Amino acid sequence: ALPTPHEIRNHLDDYVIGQEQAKKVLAVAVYNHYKRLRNGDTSNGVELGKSNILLIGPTGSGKTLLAETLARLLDVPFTMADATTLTEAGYVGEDVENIIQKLLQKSDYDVQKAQRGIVYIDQIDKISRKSDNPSITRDVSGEGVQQALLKLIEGTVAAVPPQGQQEFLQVDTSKILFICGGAFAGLDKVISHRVETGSGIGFGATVKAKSDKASEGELLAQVEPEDLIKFGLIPEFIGRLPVVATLNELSEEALIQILKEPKNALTKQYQALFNLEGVDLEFRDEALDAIAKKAMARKTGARGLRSIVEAALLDTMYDLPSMEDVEKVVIDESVIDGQSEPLLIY
């Protein structure tokens, strides 16, 4: 048997929250991949197609988290590569082919088992040209790597060193999935240019900003492939990635849920840290909402939340080891502000 979309999403819900739009996209691909791997190249329609996912979302939205959690529940092999080291035209550093060689470490040199693998890349936005269609100095990670990757996604065979005779092996990529996604920077400015159409000075010029317009979530939703051309991406590279997933910015309610519901929620991690010391740690509901408000102001995502918690308990952590006969510690909403000190129980 194979896992169902509802079953895999219930597993992802334990580790991810507030990304319903993105969970369904990854579910259909995994379902499609297993269905493609269910039949032994026998189907009513020949030349089964391949769909590539393009994950796009704000900073710290949970993109890197999905690729990690996916490999845990995924039975087939999975790799987590990076576009930072890709060296087009064989320059010093890692090469596109490396991604394939890395996929054998997880598959243990199994070609038949490797062709049915999944691939994930990160920081794909970083390899885009600086909003210029013609490249002046032949960018190695601009007009370069982006082109080099086209052959792999399209489907070809690349020689790979078997070990570290000295003969090579050929493995096709036509039936291998690739998930290339990264938080694009400055994309909102380009989208605004093509959709606001209200710039200018005058009585009849619709100019209302910083209150209603320029929403990060709404702008990304209206994205189209033509918009990425002005950003720097080549249309050929976008053509190989038909599917697009638009994540949203974490809401105030989402932050509260992420503080408690996840298995590795920060609140639970600190409790574990305090638990070994021998003092229990409890967070009062009122206090939790205050932390969420501060996080949104920073505009750093979920990752930035650690900063607020660390500063709030920085003083207590310093004095907790020297103190003795402490059973429970309670944190109040005022403590987050820093005006008051958390109470202690002996």
Partner 1 sequence: XXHXXXX
Ligand X SMILES: Nc1ncnc2c1ncn2[C@@H]1O[C@H](COP(=O)(O)OP(=O)(O)OP(O)(O)=S)[C@@H](O)[C@H]1O
Tell me if 154 sits within 8 A of 52, measured CB to CB. Answer: no
Integer Cα distance of 87 and 291 in angstroms? 42
Q: What is the CA radius of gyration of the chain?
A: 24
> Residue 19's binding partner, choosing from ligand X, a second copy, partner 1, none, with beta-carbon cut-off 5 to 8 A by kind?
ligand X
- Chain centroid, CA 227 distance in Å: 21
The dihedrals phi and psi of 214, each to the nearest 5 degrees, come to 70, 30
Using rule CB under 6 A, residue 64 touches ligand X: yes
Would you call 29 helix, strand, or coil by DSSP? helix
CB of 129 to partner 1, least distance (A): 15
Single out the residue of 71, 73, 140, 256 in contact with a second copy (rule: CB under 8 A).
140
Would you call 8 helix, strand, or coil by DSSP? helix
Q: Which region, judged by CB under 8 A, interacts with a second copy, from 110-118, 194-202, 206-214, 224-232?
A: 224-232
Single out the residue of 45, 200, 202, 204 in contact with a second copy (rule: CB under 8 A).
45
Euclidean distance between the first and the last CA atom of the chain, given in angstroms as a whole number: 55
Residues 56-115 that bind a second copy (CB under 8 A): 59-60, 64, 80, 82, 84-95
Single out the residue of 71, 73, 304, 326 in contact with a second copy (rule: CB under 8 A).
304
Using rule CB under 8 A, residue 185 touches a second copy: yes
Single out the residue of 103, 118, 258, 291 in contact with ligand X (rule: CB under 6 A).
258
- Burial of residue 220, with CB atoms counted within 10 A of its CB: 0-12 exposed, 13-18 middle, 19 or more buried: buried
Single out the residue of 11, 13, 31, 113 in contact with a second copy (rule: CB under 8 A).
31
Tell me if 9 sits within 8 A of 70, measured CB to CB. Answer: no
Please count the CA atoms within 13 angstroms of the CA of 160 that sit on its side-chain side: 26
Q: Which region, judged by CB under 8 A, interacts with a second copy, from 36-44, 196-204, 252-260, 335-343?
A: 36-44
Q: Which region, judged by CB under 6 A, interacts with ligand X, from 57-65, 202-210, 224-232, 315-323?
A: 57-65
Integer Cα distance of 163 and 168 in angstroms? 9
Site string for ligand X, 268-287 (x = CB under 6 A): --------------------
Using rule CB under 8 A, residue 225 touches a second copy: yes
Tell me the C-alpha to C-alpha distance, in Å, between residue 55 and each of 181, 247, 249: 4, 8, 14
CB of 194 to ligand X, least distance (A): 24
Integer Cα distance of 321 and 329 in angstroms? 13
Single out the residue of 8, 62, 145, 316 in contact with ligand X (rule: CB under 6 A).
62
> Residue 288's binding partner, choosing from partner 1, a second copy, ligand X, none, with beta-carbon cut-off 5 to 8 A by kind?
none
Q: Between residues 176 and 203, which has the closer beta carbon with respect to a second copy?
A: 176
